[PDB]
Amino acid sequence: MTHYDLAIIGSGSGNSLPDERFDGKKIAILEEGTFGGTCLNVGCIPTKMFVYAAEVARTITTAEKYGVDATLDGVRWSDIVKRVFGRIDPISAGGERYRSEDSPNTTVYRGHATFTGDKTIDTGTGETITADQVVIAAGSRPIIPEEIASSGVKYYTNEDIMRLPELPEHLVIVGSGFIATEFAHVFSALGSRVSIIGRSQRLLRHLDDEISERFTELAEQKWDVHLGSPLTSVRGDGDNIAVELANGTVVSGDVLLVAVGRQPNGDLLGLDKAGVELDDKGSVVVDEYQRTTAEGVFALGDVSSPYQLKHVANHEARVVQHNLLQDAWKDTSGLRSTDHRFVPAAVFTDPQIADVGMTEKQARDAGLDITVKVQAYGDVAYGWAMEDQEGICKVIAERGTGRILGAHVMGTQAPTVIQPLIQAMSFGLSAQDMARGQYWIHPALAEVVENALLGLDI
Amino acid sequence: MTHYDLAIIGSGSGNSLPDERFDGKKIAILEEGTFGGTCLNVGCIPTKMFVYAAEVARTITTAEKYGVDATLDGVRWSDIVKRVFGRIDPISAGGERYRSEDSPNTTVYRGHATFTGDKTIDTGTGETITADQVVIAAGSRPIIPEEIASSGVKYYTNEDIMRLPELPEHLVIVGSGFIATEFAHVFSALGSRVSIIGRSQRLLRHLDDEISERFTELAEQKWDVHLGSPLTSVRGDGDNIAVELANGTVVSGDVLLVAVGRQPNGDLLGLDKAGVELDDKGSVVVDEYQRTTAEGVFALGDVSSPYQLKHVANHEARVVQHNLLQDAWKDTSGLRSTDHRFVPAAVFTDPQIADVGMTEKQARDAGLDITVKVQAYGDVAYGWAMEDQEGICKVIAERGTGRILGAHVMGTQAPTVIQPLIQAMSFGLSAQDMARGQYWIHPALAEVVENALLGLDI
Ligand SMILES: Cc1cc2nc3c(=O)[nH]c(=O)nc-3n(C[C@H](O)[C@H](O)[C@H](O)COP(=O)(O)OP(=O)(O)OC[C@H]3O[C@@H](n4cnc5c(N)ncnc54)[C@H](O)[C@@H]3O)c2cc1C
Numbered sequence: 077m078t079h080y081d082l083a084i085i086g087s088g089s090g091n092s093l094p095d096e097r098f099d100g101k102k103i104a105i106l107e108e109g110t111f112g113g114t115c116l117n118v119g120c121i122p123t124k125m126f127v128y129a130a131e132v133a134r135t136i137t138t139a140e141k142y143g144v145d146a147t148l149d150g151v152r153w154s155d156i157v158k159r160v161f162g163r164i165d166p167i168s169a170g171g172e173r174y175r176s177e178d179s180p181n182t183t184v185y186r187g188h189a190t191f192t193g194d195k196t197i198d199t200g201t202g203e204t205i206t207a208d209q210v211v212i213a214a215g216s217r218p219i220i221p222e223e224i225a226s227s228g229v230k231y232y233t234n235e236d237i238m239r240l241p242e243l244p245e246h247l248v249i250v251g252s253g254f255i256a257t258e259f260a261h262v263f264s265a266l267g268s269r270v271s272i273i274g275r276s277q278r279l280l281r282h283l284d285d286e287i288s289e290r291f292t293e294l295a296e297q298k299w300d301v302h303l304g305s306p307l308t309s310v311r312g313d314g315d316n317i318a319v320e321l322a323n324g325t326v327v328s329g330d331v332l333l334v335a336v337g338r339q340p341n342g343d344l345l346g347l348d349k350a351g352v353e354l355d356d357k358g359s360v361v362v363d364e365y366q367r368t369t370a371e372g373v374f375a376l377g378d379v380s381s382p383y384q385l386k387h388v389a390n391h392e393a394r395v396v397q398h399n400l401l402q403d404a405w406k407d408t409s410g411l412r413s414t415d416h417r418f419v420p421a422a423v424f425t426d427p428q429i430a431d432v433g434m435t436e437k438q439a440r441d442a443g444l445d446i447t448v449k450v451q452a453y454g455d456v457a458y459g460w461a462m463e464d465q466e467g468i469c470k471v472i473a474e475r476g477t478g479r480i481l482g483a484h485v486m487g488t489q490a491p492t493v494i495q496p497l498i499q500a501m502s503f504g505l506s507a508q509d510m511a512r513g514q515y516w517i518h519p520a521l522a523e524v525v526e527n528a529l530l531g532l533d534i
Numbered sequence: 535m536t537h538y539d540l541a542i543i544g545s546g547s548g549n550s551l552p553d554e555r556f557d558g559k560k561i562a563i564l565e566e567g568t569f570g571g572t573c574l575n576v577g578c579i580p581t582k583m584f585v586y587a588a589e590v591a592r593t594i595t596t597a598e599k600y601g602v603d604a605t606l607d608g609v610r611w612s613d614i615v616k617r618v619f620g621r622i623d624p625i626s627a628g629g630e631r632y633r634s635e636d637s638p639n640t641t642v643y644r645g646h647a648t649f650t651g652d653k654t655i656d657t658g659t660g661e662t663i664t665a666d667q668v669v670i671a672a673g674s675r676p677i678i679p680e681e682i683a684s685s686g687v688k689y690y691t692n693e694d695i696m697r698l699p700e701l702p703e704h705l706v707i708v709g710s711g712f713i714a715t716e717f718a719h720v721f722s723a724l725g726s727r728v729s730i731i732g733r734s735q736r737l738l739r740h741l742d743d744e745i746s747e748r749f750t751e752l753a754e755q756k757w758d759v760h761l762g763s764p765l766t767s768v769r770g771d772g773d774n775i776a777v778e779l780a781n782g783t784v785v786s787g788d789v790l791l792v793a794v795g796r797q798p799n800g801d802l803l804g805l806d807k808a809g810v811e812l813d814d815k816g817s818v819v820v821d822e823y824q825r826t827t828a829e830g831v832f833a834l835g836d837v838s839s840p841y842q843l844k845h846v847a848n849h850e851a852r853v854v855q856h857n858l859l860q861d862a863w864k865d866t867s868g869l870r871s872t873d874h875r876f877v878p879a880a881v882f883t884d885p886q887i888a889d890v891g892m893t894e895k896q897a898r899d900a901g902l903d904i905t906v907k908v909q910a911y912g913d914v915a916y917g918w919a920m921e922d923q924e925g926i927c928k929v930i931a932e933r934g935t936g937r938i939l940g941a942h943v944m945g946t947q948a949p950t951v952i953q954p955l956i957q958a959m960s961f962g963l964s965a966q967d968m969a970r971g972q973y974w975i976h977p978a979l980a981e982v983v984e985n986a987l988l989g990l991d992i
């Protein structure tokens with residue numbers, strides 16, 4: 077057996093750990109799929125490249141309301157797929173080389189890793205290795221309902237849909253999460269009619285109810301939305317696919333995209349042989365120092381975190397990287413803890429949505445004395461420039477102190493507009509201070525935040 | 535003579551002064567032109583409404599770089615003018631109503647006001663009034679070169695160009711400031727040929743040298759740029775206008791736009807009769823209490839401020855309004871001081887520009903030990919989604935402390951992207967904390983700021 081000071085399962089956020097301070101130690105990296113993890117190859121980055129092209133198309137079909145006449149002649153889907161992965165694939169693959177060929181003290185294994193012992197890992201390549209410390213960066217994988225993975229019909233996930241040969245005439249999406257609603261926006265804007273099937277009574281059910289409700293009402297005018305009904309059976313009739321719901325409705329289309337959720341891959345690693353505890357949802361249990369229940373074993377990313385988000389896994393990687401070099405199970409004094417406090421999320425759909433902190437419901441359930449202002453985009457000068465009638469910025473702050481508790485933006489550049497709120501929240505800045513203690517450029521999209529704060533009572 | 539507790543010259547930011555705390559006080563408002571001041575009617579608001587339509591036109595003409603085929607059929611200038619001012623004039627006039635219709639104890643004068651005495655004001659309507667306190671909100675007026683306003687040729691300024699009946703085939707602009715380059719962006723994107731004549735060797739001379747330099751290179755590939763030689767004569771040959779420069783070049787076109795700068799309106803008020811001091815360029819002299827040299831008189835806005843910016847003038851009104859109600863010339867303890875420190879500016883041209891703090895030159899001339907990072911838009915995942923090759927985020931931070939001293943962004947949504955820097959600066963937030971002490975949404979335009987901070991040397 078080959079011994080290492082460090083073994084890393086997962087080339088996602090796991091690849092960000094080895095830097096200069098580790099040069100004197102030999103590292104083993106295990107990657108069963110594409111190099112670079114879900115984020116680079118089939119997730120955050122390539123998705124938003126399609127979203128951008130879809131937003132350009134939306135600009136064109138709506139240009140009349142601004143007094144500019146234009147026609148959307150067509151979309152070259154193949155050339156879009158060509159352009160996106162024409163940049164993604166050389167990058168994923170350039171890093172794979174770096175780790176296996178420059179490899180100053182690194183060894184890459186291309187197999188499914190599995191714990192056979194304490195720090196004993198079957199590589200899936202026919203080898204077994206040992207490590208002084210191990211980091212689990214196994215991420216998550218799409219959840220496929222049994223009704224789909226038994227019918228025998230062709231279905232898609234984020235792992236292949238972005239590489240379709242042609243644009244589907246009718247896309248049927250199973251799911252109401254951010255993956256489903258982002259793909260609905262991408263495809264519908266480019267020319268596909270999208271049908272979305274949701275189990276819940278709203279799309280993006282788990283967001284603030286005012287955001288979830290209004291987006292659903294806007295979505296109903298853009299896509300064929302079917303809520304409240306779980307699917308019951310799937311039937312493939314040639315190239316056409318039919319999906320039967322519990323209420324009896326049958327949704328037929330060209331391509332079936334499954335986006336019902338993601339499952340952390342901890343259950344695939346044989347963690348029981350390593351003494352790594354799994355909780356009730358399949359995430360590996362770690363502490364504020366990302367140290368698991370097992371010695372010398374850390375975890376990060378979708379395999380452990382409650383927020384299956386890249387910027388979270390990257391933050392935790394900074395913590396693991398530092399805690400890796402000290403006396404982890406001996407000295408907590410030199411250890412850094414992970415800050416899981418003001419985690420933002422974004423949905424790149426139309427309208428685009430971003431959040432951070434608590435929903436208004438969550439604020440009241442905690443029994444908080446709050447003030448709330450929902451500011452309309454079309455009420456600031458920049459919102460008029462856009463002739464906006466959908467955008468809102470809802471800020472929930474606390475009465476008396478002005479301590480902001482949450483912010484929810486639905487509208488253009490939502491993931492960027494919220495950043496001043498993320499910033500003020502993360503550093504304890506009061507809302508009355510954020511409004512008046514700085515200048516806001518007039519007139520820019522930013523002014524919606526300022527007026528949201530100015531409309532807040534105390 | 536009619537006596538008042540307060541007289542206000544200027545319906546721009548001056549109209550924002552009377553609130554609830556003045557209900558028991560009689561107020562006189564003097565406005566010689568259109569109600570609402572420059573920003574609402576011929577300035578801040580209507581320009582950015584045109585700029586957005588120009589961004590729609592640009593999106594369509596460049597959309598193929600994303601794999602979307604579209605044609606710019608035409609531009610409906612008349613329909614642009616109606617849509618912009620179709621909401622602007624009912625608002626200006628709705629506000630004119632409110633002050634004469636709600637008017638609890640307020641009187642509006644539509645005439646050119648001039649100080650004839652201490653606090654004695656000729657209304658320009660044939661009356662003379664006095665007030666216990668006076669606020670000057672007279673703003674500024676366009677500067678017209680003598681060669682232009684003597685030639686007898688028809689010329690336009692920002693006060694009428696947005697009300698042209700038709701789109702000019704070839705627009706000739708005299709100026710290199712933010713007004714010239716915003717209008718250069720507006721017309722060229724909509725179909726006009728644009729010639730820009732600047733006396734300087736760069737457009738936007740007053741920006742960070744790297745920002746001004748790259749923007750000029752980009753402008754030169756979009757417009758007919760004439761640098762380094764001042765104009766000498768203007769001669770009209772029918773409807774066509776020809777402008778001769780000092781080097782001998784003659785730039786001819788159909789429409790002449792003058793955008794060389796603005797002059798504060800202090801010189802027109804007969805101010806010496808009031809003992810209100812004017813400095814060396816014509817702004818009314820005030821202190822941190824917006825107090826002029828004469829008792830009972832304040833000033834604000836473009837008529838006094840060094841920053842002829844709306845968000846500044848609105849802030850100064852907040853100070854004047856509060857200090858108006860106390861004994862400013864007796865007890866400074868209860869008074870509001872104006873914060874003129876982290877004033878941002880933005881130019882809504884192609885590419886969009888925003889700045890705050892110190893330029894690299896200003897930082898070095900001030901003898902600070904600085905570090906600089908110029909981050910390109912196309913280096914974060916969102917820059918790939920746009921296929922950006924022009925955007926930059928330049929951050930100037932101090933070595934050792936990481937305290938930011940300046941930030942300069944050229945690219946999409948520059949006035950919104952920069953706001954986290956304005957905020958972090960305004961509350962003394964360091965780069966080391968701002969970068970890592972908060973979460974940034976992946977992948978959004980915001981990440982360009984994050985990596986700019988990550989690239990700073992200490
Ligand atoms: C469609 C989609 C869109 C997304 N959009 C966003 C977004 O906008 N913003 C955001 O912040 N996040 C987004 N995410 C989430 C982000 O892509 C991931 O959550 C992120 O990569 C988490 O990092 P990770 O390394 O833990 O996961 P991963 O990147 O999946 O890393 C896990 C790695 O381990 C490997 N592995 C698994 N099992 C084995 C084994 N047995 N042996 C060897 N190797 C193995 C996998 O091949 C993979 O390379 C998105 C995800 C998806 C699917």
Ligand SMILES: Cc1cc2nc3c(=O)[nH]c(=O)nc-3n(C[C@H](O)[C@H](O)[C@H](O)COP(=O)(O)OP(=O)(O)OC[C@H]3O[C@@H](n4cnc5c(N)ncnc54)[C@H](O)[C@@H]3O)c2cc1C
Nearest residue numbers: 544546547565566567571572647672673835836842843844
């Ligand atoms: C084209 C353009 C674009 C701009 N864009 C921006 C931008 O994006 N952001 C920004 O922050 N700033 C911008 N500005 C600057 C902005 O217009 C000013 O900073 C702001 O309007 C200052 O407000 P004010 O009330 O002091 O000036 P004004 O709005 O001009 O108010 C002065 C008013 O007083 C009246 N008046 C003058 N003299 C007399 C008199 N003797 N008697 C009676 N009434 C009188 C005038 O008619 C006018 O209505 C722009 C300016 C222009 C010209």
